[PDB]
Structure formats: structure tokens, C-alpha cells
Amino acid sequence: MQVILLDKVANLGSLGDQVNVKAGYARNFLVPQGKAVPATKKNIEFFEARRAELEAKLAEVLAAANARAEKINALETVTIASKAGDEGKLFGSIGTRDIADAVTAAGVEVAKSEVRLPNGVLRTTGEHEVSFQVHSEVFAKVIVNVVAE
Amino acid sequence: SRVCQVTGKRPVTGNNRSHALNATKRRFLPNLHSHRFWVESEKRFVTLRVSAKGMRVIDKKGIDTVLAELRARGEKY
RNA sequence: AGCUUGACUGCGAGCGUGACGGCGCGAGCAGGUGCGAAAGCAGGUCAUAGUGAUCCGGUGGUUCUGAAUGGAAGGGCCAUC
RNA sequence: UUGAGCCUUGAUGUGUAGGAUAGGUGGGAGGCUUUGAAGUGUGGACGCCAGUCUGCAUGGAGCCGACCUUGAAAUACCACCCUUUAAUGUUUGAUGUUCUAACGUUGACCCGUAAUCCGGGUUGCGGACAGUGUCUGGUGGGUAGUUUGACUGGGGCGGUC
RNA sequence: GUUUAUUAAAAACACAGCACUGUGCAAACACGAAAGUGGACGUAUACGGUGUGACGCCUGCCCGGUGCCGGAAGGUUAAU
RNA sequence: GGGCGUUAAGUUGCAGGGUAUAGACCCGAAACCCGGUGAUCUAGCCAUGGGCAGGUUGAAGGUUGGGUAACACUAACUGGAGGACCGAACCGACUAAUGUUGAAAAAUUAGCGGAUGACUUGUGGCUGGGGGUGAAAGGCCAAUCAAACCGGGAGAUAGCU
RNA sequence: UAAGGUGAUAUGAACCGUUAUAACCGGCGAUUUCCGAAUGGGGAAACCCAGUGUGUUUCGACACACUAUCAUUAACUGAAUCCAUAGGUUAAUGAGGCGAACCGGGGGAACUGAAACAUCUAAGUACCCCGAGGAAAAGAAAUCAACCGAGAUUCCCCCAG
RNA sequence: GGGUGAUUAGCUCAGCUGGGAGAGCACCUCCCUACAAGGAGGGGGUCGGCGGUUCGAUCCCGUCAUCACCCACCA
């Protein structure tokens, strides 16, 4: 089965490369988990004639900073609201639109998390270094409110 | 009855014929497993009742007339 | 005792029996021969029980057949199981 | 880890006797080593104790050969095939192990819905098993269809066909 | 205490109890192929199946047969 | 040589006898399969509501006086346990009796057994014909029963009266 | 279309006509209660009870109108949820119940025959379940045919015993 | 009344295509010491009776004698 890779998955190919995979693994994981797309002798434009030419200009010809590098690139404190209890209970800060963010965006609405916590379970106040690892070319980090006051 | 929605696969005529040589009925049916997929004309993922090979019909046959025939019979997806 | 293996091949004036199936007997002709000086006899044993059909199937033979044309599977025929 | 299968490329290949690690089977002079030859022996792994080596110290195409001598067989440079080896690509079984992504939820809670059934979500956990089907071996009077004679101074017992 | 209503009211049937046994909860199991529901919204001191039948005193022999539980190697042996 | 063959004319319409198949000769099983009815009977479960004149044993429990280390003891006061005593209703159906084209498709009488109990029962609902429901008798299921009733296969089939 | 009539039990009573409303016949419409598909919402066969509007007066309320769900499609709205989906509120079109046959597909016996039975017979036959139209269904050769040829299908008779 | 099977060493019993007899345990004699015991050595068959088949019959067949066992069978 012909597919195009959209994520770091598998040893074969890379992001924007067409590859051949068994229809089984292309049915249970790669397509439903959004890691790849079919090619159908037609969809071979999906990256190379759709995504790959602004990649060379966006932050080096048309502007100086990429779409989130104009918002954060150094170590920032988290700006999304937080409030903890007397037993240090954090009462949130881990859900899809309540989890740690430091750029205070407006008019936008999100449905899934993008960050990696230092532990995937977080119930209580403390120091936490939170990482943005959505694409291997990019790294950013933020620090949570240690008292949630 | 358990039927495939994309292929129209129905129950079949068939006998035992082994232990004994008899024309005794046993009731033969397609085994359902369903598939949850995308058609680009519906703004959603769709779960459709399919059996063995029925998902491999969706893979490479045109289905827009069957998606309309289900609706011409009032059947839900 | 000597040799012989007729424990015959293709047949048949035909015949005794029984409702029939079936059984039982055979003049006599020819093929290939055996004993014998030769005729003649030998168609298994002195005569009567030791096993009975149709069917599918085993075995080898077969231009008798074989399915649009040519094989071959299949069918029959012959011989035995 | 171990079966059924593949041949791709580098390495591997010697008792005796001997200069001496000639795999098998065939060619024949100018051709070549690039993850290879030295230093070569300190330590380690092998050995017929003759020799062979990773590594490290160390270097990058030389140099070598036919005559000759030993030997069935010849000693440059080498195609293909095999044995010993290793890695690569790679089809398919046996058994056990891991992960998450099919499947599952009679796990948590969220909404339609101030609903008990349902659907989908958020989020966990089980997990390619279980489940569901097709083929298949057992087990199944629990249930079901069916058979199990005729003779006789009347049957049985006896004797009979 | 129950029963052949309409020829048998019993020594048969039932029972606290006694024994043998299944069952870890989406229990075992039933009817339905399932949809559900009951068991039960109970949880091994609970529930299911079966036998035995106050109590007291006691209770020998047998694994050839028939079924179960465990042992797990091997044999006969299917699809493949 | 043998066998079978080379001279009897059939065919078409009507008239008749037979045969096959038709309902095949008329009436006629038990039984089977399919589609339904009936759970106001009767059985059992579920829910919601009734019935038991009156008499017996006066116990158990409650509490206080004496009192012991501690009660059981000793002495009074109080008080209402039962698949218990007896006995109408009511229910049972053990014995006697009348009845048998009955007054009754087992009913009516007397004795007997039970009588707050595993008792007795009114109304609804749930379960049904190879199916129900049974402290079981293969009992009973709307007068019908080890397969009721109704409608079909079907004028089933019957070496038989 | 006519000079006579106004249903039957059926008398009794009373009128209506000659030329358009005597009586009545044909067509195309209007009106079309409650139950029944039966459908605003409910029900144990003709009973019970709402929602949303319009209009109007003296406004303790009538008159009139619209209204199952399901499906298709659109509009408006709108959960978890961002886009979206259900759910919510409407509109346009469509099924639904019925007399008869013919007729399309599904589920499908037992009886009977083999002179017992089990593949086979009987038989896709009955009964049942769904359902359409003037007919239903058939249909325009990856077809027959046998080297010659035919050139969608249906019906009738042969082909055939 | 009817029937099944046996008869061989003292006792248990082998040996049927029909081929002139064998074991166990006893016993007898002996050893050890006196018997149980231990050990050693050793033994002999009316292989039912009479007929028939056979070369040959306990052995196959009939029939009587004997024993143990089965059984006296529907209304």
C-alpha cells in the first residue's frame, strides 16, 4: 500500500516522502493515528506541491520569526490560569485546553494537547519543566506556577 | 438480520452433507465486524456495518450510489 | 509302474429336471495335444453336498468405444478377484 | 532461540612431508589490495607450535609471478560453485518476551439527558489474547429420526429356515 | 406439612439438618443462536447442582467397569 | 457348424375389455407436520388486597427483696412464646351413606383431619400444546388429556374390519 | 330523460310536478362525524385529554385553523465540541390500512414412495412472511452452435419421456 | 423332568490340528538338632466304564455311571 509520511514514524522514509507499507499497519495505526496519508496515484502533491516551498521563506525571506518563535523562544513562565488548594491540589492544569501555555493567544480554540509533561500524572503543586516536542526540528520549554496563587 | 451495507451481502442456502450425507440446514451468515472511516462528502467519520471482504470493497469500488441507495431505503449511517 | 496334466480352446443332435431364477448330462465338429502297437479314451476324480443374483469396486489385456478436432479420464469386451 | 526457504557481499579453507594454510572446478600477464600488506610482538584468541588474527601502537598500492622446486595438482591476476563464518535484504512455521495501534470496558466521568437502554467524547487500563466466524478432531440418549424376521396340532424353553 | 382432582393420603413426597460438589462476580447457570432478563444488584458465613433425612452408637473389603480431578511426557489422531 | 433373419400390414377415427396415473374403489385409523385458539378451569410465580366464633396451658420476657468473689440460688411483683391443647367458619378428602338416562358430567350428607400456619383466599398480571405448571401423581391445563381445542397438508396412508 | 312522482319493511301522514330544483340517470367536483392506517396526546371498538395561532365584545371562552413518528432533502438552531454530529424547531415529497385474481422474492414441512430405512422419494408441494403493477417477472449474448449457422425475451405445441 | 461342564501324581491341575504324560504344594528317605522350622535327595499314574469314526482316541462322536452347579420356565 502506497502512503506519504507526515510524522517521524518507522525506519523507512521521512516527512514528505512516499513509501510502501502493508495494508494491515496502514489500517490499524498509520492512517487513523494521522502519522501518514494514502497516495492513490493522485495525492502525491500533498507535501511537495502544497507544503515544501513556504518552508524556505516564512522566517528567512518574508519575515524573521516562525509562527510561534514570534511568541516564545527563551525560558518563559506559564501564562494560562492556575489555582491550587491548601493541601497543594492543583485542580487541573493537565486537560486539552487547561494545560500549561505561556503565549496568551486569543480568538483561537484548541482540542488536543501539544506538550510533554515531566510526568504524565500531575495532581499537586511543585516545580515542573514542560517541553514542546511536536516536531524533532523544534524545542521550547516553559515553567509552571509553583504556588498557583 | 446481519447484513453488509456496502455489498448487500445476505444469508445463503446451504446444507450439512458431512456426517451424515444429509441435506440438513445449519443457517449460514456473513460475520460482521464493522469499519469506521471517511468519505469526504460527509463532514464526519462514519461507522458502517460490514463483514469479511466488505472493507476491501470500500477500499477500491465507488460507493456514492450505495450511500444513496441506503438512503433511498431509509437505512441509517 | 512308465509317461502325461485334457484340473483343455472355439462350440454343440441337443437333453432330464422346475412355474421361473437355477441346477444336472451330452452325441458330435474343429484347435492344440497326451498315453499307446493301435483302436480308444482324456471336456478332471465312481455317481450325489462343500456354496447364490443384480451393484459399485480390484488386476492385466483391448482401434470396440470416447463425446467441436486430437489425446486421455470415463464406458463395454476378454481374462480372473 | 530454533525449523522450512533464498544465495547477496566481505571474510573462511593447512594433519604427514615441504619453501609452504594450493578449498573445489576451470582460465592465463601484466594486474591489483582502500574496513588493505607491513609493525610484530607486549597482552589476549586460536594452532599441527608450523603459523593465523581483531585491537593498539600504525600505514595506505604496492609488489609479485611463469623458469624453478615440492606436490595428483601451483605458486601474479581471477570468473563460478562448495564448506566454515558474519552481516544485509527477506517469504513462512514452532515456543516464549515487549510495546500500542485492531478488539475490549459488566474501569473512571462527560454530554445529549435534572434518563436507567444508547451513541460519541475526554481519560485510563486490559490487549492482538479474549471475542466473532469458517474449516476440524473429540465429547454429547441431554434431545431426535429409525431398525430389531418367519416356523410351531397356542406361545416360551427346545428344535427349525 | 404434601399427593394420583374422580378406586391409593402411604412406608412414597417435603424438612430444619447431614454429606458430596460447582462458583472470584461480566460467578456458576437458565430460555433465546441473540435481544434481554432472572441468579443479584447478593459476593464463598453467598449463590447454583445432586443425594441423604431427628438423634445416639458405630461404620469392613474393592480402582476390573462408568464419570470427574490433577499429572503432563509419550501413543492413536483432524484441518493444515 | 450353430443362433437369429430374408411373406402375414400396419395406421388413423370410433366401439369395447384390460393396465398405468389420476381422489382411482366407497366409508375409515392411530399418528405425523404446519398455522392458530384457550391460563375467567387448573397448576405455579409475581404484585395488590381479604378470612380464622370462642375456650386452653399462663409459659417466655420485664423487675425488685434476700444474697455470692461471681453467678446459677433464694423470695416476691409483673407479663401474653407456639408449623402447641381443643373447637364452629373455612379448607382438606381418611371412613360411612345416597346417587349412576344424576339435583350434581364426583355432587350432597354425617363422622374424621387441619383451623396465625409450610394455613386458607378475592382481583389483576406472567408462563401454553412436543408447550406450559407441578412438597410429583409422567398429575393437571375452561365438561375433552402419556399430547386438549380449532384450522390446513388431506377424500393422508392401511397386503386391514 | 319525462308526465307523472316524494327508498324498503309499510302501512299511516304530508306534498312535489309538466320548463330549467317533480322524480332521477351519466360525468367532473364540493361536503365527508367517532372508531378503524388511524396519526395533536391517551384508551379495555365508537370513549378520554392537550398544544399553537387568529378574531372579538360587556372579555368567569367561544368560533375558526394548523399539528403522529419514520425516511429523503433543505432551512433555522444546536451537547460533550473547536470545524462538525446528534438532539431541538419547521417545510416539501413518500410509505403506512383495504377487495379479488393474476404475480415477484423470502421461511418451508410432514404425509407418501423405496412394498422396513438412513442419500433418494414425496417437494420449493401446503401452510407461512414481505410486496409491486396493469400486468408481475423476462430482456438486448464474456449466448448458443459444431466449422454449417443463428443473432434480446415471453407465450402456445413439439423437442420428450 | 430339562441342561452346562468336568473325571490325569495324595490335593490343585496343565497338556486338542488326534501322536504312547508334566509342574506346584504335599509326601517319602536323608542332613542339621528332638519335633516345628531350615536344607538336601527321591517317588509312582486303572489320564471314569462300554461302543463307533481313526493308523493312533482320556483327547473326535454316542451312551451309561459320578460330582458340582444351573433350572423347573405363560395364563
CATH number for position A75: 3.10.430.100
In terms of Cα–Cα distance, which of A78, A89, A97 is closest to A124? A89
- Report the distance from CA of residue B3 to the C1' of nucleotide F106 in Å, as an integer: 62
User: Is residue A32's beta carbon less than 7 angstroms from any atom in nucleic acid strand D?
Assistant: yes
Asked if B17 and B61 count as a contact pair (C-beta separation under 8 A), the reply is: no
Would you say B51 and B9 are in contact if contact means Cβ atoms under 8 Å apart?
yes
Q: SS3 sequence, A15-56? A: CCCEEECCCCHHHHHHCCCCCEEECCCCHHHCCCCCCCCHHH
- The CB density around residue A99, as the number of other CB atoms within 10 Å, is 19
> How many angstroms separate the CA atoms of B63 and B8, rounded?
12
Longest Cα separation, chain B? 54
C1' of H5 to CA of A49 (Å): 108
What nine digits make up the cell of A82?
492556575
Q: How was this structure determined?
A: cryo-EM
Q: Which of A51, A42, A41 is nearest to A16 (CA)?
A: A51
3-state DSSP: chain B helix, strand, coil percent, rounded to 5? 20, 15, 65
* Beta carbons of A30 and A21 less than 8 angstroms apart: yes
Whether residue A37 contacts residue A6, with contact meaning beta carbons closer than 8 Å, is answered with yes
Residue B72: CB partners within 8 Å, gap ≥ 6?
none
Nucleotide minimizing C1' to CA distance for residue B2: E34
C1'-nearest nucleotide to the CA of B15: G119
Residues in chain B: 77
Q: Indicate the SS3 state at residue B70.
A: helix
* Interruptions in chain A after residues (C–N over 2.5 Å): none
Sheet strand arrangement including A76-77: A76-77, A140-143, A129-132
Distance B23 CA to G161 C1' (A): 28
Q: Which domain holds residue A140?
A: 69-148
Cα B10 from chain centroid (whole Å): 7
Q: Which residue has the cell 499497519?
A: A25
B71 touches strand G (CB under 7 A): yes
Whether cis (ω within 30° of 0) applies to the bond prior to A56 is no
Strand-pairing partners, residue A19, are: A3
Hunting for cell 450510489 — which residue is that? Answer: B65
Report resolution (Å) to 1 decimal: 9.0
- State the nucleotide closest to B45 in CA–C1' terms: G85
Enumerate residues 6+ apart whose C-beta is below 8 A from A130.
A78, A100, A115, A116, A117, A118, A141, A142, A143, A144
Cα A64 to Cα A20, A68, A70, A138, distances in angstroms = 38, 12, 8, 16
